[PDB]
Short mmCIF file of C-alpha atoms in Angstrom, two decimals:
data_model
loop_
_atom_site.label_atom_id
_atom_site.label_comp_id
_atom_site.label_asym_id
_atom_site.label_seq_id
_atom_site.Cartn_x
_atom_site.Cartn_y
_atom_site.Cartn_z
CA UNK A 1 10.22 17.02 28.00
CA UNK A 2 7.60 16.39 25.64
CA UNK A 3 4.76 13.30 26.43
CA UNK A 4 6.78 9.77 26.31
CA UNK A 5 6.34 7.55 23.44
CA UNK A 6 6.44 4.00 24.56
CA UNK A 7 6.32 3.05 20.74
CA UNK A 8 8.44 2.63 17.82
CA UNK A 9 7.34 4.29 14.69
CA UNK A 10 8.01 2.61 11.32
CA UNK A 11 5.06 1.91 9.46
CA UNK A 12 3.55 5.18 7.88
CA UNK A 13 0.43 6.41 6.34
CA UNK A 14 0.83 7.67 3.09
CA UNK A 15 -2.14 9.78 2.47
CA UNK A 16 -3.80 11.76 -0.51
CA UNK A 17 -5.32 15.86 -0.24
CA UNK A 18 -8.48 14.03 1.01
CA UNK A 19 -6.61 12.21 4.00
CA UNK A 20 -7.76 8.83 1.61
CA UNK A 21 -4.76 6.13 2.99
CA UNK A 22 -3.39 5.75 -0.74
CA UNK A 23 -0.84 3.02 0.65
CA UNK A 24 1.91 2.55 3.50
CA UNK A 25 5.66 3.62 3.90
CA UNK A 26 8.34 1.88 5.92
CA UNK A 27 11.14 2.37 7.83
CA UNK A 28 13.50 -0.27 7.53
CA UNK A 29 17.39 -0.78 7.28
CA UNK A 30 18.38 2.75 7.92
CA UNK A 31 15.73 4.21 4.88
CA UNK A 32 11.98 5.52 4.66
CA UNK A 33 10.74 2.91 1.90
CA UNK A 34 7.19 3.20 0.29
CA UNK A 35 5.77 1.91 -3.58
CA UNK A 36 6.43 4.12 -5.94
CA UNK A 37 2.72 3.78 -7.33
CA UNK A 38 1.65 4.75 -3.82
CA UNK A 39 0.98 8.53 -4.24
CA UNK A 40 0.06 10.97 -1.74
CA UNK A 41 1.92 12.33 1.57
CA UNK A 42 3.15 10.96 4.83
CA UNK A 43 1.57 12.67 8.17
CA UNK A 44 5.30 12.81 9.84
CA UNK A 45 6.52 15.56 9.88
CA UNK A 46 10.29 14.64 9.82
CA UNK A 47 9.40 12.29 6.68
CA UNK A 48 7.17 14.43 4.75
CA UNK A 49 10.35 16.92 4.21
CA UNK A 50 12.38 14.52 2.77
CA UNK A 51 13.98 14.21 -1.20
CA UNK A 52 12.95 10.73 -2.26
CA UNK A 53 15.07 8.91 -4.91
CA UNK A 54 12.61 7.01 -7.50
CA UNK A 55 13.48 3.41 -8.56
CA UNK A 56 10.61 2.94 -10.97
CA UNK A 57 11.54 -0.19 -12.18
CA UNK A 58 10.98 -2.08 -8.68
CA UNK A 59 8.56 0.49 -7.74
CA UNK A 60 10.07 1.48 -4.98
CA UNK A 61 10.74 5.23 -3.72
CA UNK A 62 13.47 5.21 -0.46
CA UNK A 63 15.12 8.15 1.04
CA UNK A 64 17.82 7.96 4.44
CA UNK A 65 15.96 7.99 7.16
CA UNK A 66 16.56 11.18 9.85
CA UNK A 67 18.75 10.21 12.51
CA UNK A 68 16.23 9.98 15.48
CA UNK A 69 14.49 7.50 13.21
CA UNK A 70 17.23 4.71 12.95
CA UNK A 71 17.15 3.09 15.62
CA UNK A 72 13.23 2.06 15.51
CA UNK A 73 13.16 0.69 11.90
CA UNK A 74 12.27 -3.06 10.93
CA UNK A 75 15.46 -5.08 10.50
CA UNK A 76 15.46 -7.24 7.09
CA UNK A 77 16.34 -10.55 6.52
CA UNK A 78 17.11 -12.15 3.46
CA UNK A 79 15.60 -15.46 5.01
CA UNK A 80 12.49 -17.16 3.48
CA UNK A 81 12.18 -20.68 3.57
CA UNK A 82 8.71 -22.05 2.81
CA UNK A 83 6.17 -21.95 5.08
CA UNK A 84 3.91 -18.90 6.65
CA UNK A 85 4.50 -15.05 7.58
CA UNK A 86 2.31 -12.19 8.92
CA UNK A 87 0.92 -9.09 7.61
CA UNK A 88 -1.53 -6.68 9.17
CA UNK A 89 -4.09 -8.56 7.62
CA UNK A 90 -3.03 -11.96 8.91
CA UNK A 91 -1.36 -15.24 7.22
CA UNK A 92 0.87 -14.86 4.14
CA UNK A 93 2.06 -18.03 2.99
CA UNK A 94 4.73 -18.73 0.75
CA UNK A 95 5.34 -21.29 -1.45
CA UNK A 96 6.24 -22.28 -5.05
CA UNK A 97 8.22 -19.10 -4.99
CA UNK A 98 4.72 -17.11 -4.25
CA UNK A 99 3.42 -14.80 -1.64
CA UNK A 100 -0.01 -15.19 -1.46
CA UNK A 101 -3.00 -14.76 1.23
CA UNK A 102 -6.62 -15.18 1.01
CA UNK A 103 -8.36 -12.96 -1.37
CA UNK A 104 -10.37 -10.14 0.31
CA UNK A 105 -7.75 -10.17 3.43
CA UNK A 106 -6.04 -7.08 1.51
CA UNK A 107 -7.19 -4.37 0.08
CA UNK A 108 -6.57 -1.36 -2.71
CA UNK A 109 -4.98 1.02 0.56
CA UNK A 110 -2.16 -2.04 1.81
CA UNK A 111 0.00 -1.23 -0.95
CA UNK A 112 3.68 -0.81 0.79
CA UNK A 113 3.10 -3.18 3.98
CA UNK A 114 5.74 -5.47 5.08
CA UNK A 115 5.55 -9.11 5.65
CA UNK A 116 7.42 -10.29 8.40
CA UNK A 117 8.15 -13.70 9.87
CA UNK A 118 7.22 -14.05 13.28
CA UNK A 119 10.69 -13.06 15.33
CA UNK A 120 9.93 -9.65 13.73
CA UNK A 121 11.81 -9.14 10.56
CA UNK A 122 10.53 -7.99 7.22
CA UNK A 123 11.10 -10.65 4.47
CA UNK A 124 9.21 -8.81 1.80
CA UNK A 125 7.09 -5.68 1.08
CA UNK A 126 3.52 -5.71 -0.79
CA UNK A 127 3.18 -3.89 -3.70
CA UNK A 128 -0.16 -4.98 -5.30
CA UNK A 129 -1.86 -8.60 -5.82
CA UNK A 130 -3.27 -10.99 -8.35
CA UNK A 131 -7.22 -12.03 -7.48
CA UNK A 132 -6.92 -15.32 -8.56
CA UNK A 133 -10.45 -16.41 -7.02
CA UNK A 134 -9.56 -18.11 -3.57
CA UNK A 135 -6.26 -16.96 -3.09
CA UNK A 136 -4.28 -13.32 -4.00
CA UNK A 137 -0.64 -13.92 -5.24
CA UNK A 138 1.09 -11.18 -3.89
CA UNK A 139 3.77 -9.12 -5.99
CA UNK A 140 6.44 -7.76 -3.54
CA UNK A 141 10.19 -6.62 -3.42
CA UNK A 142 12.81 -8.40 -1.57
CA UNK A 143 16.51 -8.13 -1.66
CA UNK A 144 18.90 -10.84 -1.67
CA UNK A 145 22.08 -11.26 0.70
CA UNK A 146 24.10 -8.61 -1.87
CA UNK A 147 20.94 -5.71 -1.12
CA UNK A 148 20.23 -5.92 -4.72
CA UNK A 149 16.32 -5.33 -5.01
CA UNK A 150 14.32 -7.95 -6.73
CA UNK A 151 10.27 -7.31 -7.80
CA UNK A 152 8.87 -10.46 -8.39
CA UNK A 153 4.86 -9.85 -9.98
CA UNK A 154 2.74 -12.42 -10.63
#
């Protein structure tokens, strides 16, 4: 058998020629999920063989994920009362309908991370921010309880 993994893959470098992190993929919900803006490759080699379908107008790029992958993906939930959530990077708070987190926490290479509350689940994914001094306001897509994608950009 080849060395044991004792962890779950589902967050993914997506990488430019130079091996510059351009931004991160997903896997979530049964699908590899990255920006669409985020442009470069992902160092997997079961992902980085796979046809993408574009969504440009939520940015988003998605393709099934391969079978062996299913099982470790982030679950989503629809689920996001007001309050605080976690990213990489630390607290994201939301309220008045806004992601945001403290300016500088990010930066230009987090494009495509997940927020998650704190059992786990994703309840949104980054796609870029607003430096509004103090505080970044976060635009991200969710989907609501029918899947339907929503980009919300402030």
């Amino acid at each position: 058998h080849m060395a044991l993994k004792f962890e779950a893959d589902r967050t993914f470098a997506v990488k430019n020629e130079d091996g510059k992190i351009m931004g991160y993929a997903v896997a979530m919900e049964g699908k590899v999920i990255k920006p669409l803006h985020v442009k470069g490759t992902i160092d997997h080699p079961a992902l980085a063989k796979l046809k993408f379908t574009k969504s440009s107008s939520y940015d988003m790029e998605f393709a099934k994920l391969p079978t062996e992958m299913k099982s470790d993906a982030f679950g989503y939930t629809t689920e996001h009362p007001e309050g605080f959530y976690n990213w990489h990077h630390g607290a994201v708070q939301f309220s008045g309908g806004r992601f945001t987190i403290p300016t500088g926490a990010g930066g230009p290479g987090d494009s495509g991370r997940p927020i998650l509350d704190n059992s786990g689940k994703v309840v949104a994914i980054v796609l870029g921010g607003a430096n509004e001094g103090a505080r970044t306001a976060l635009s991200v897509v969710t989907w609501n309880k029918k899947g339907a994608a929503i980009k919300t950009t402030h």
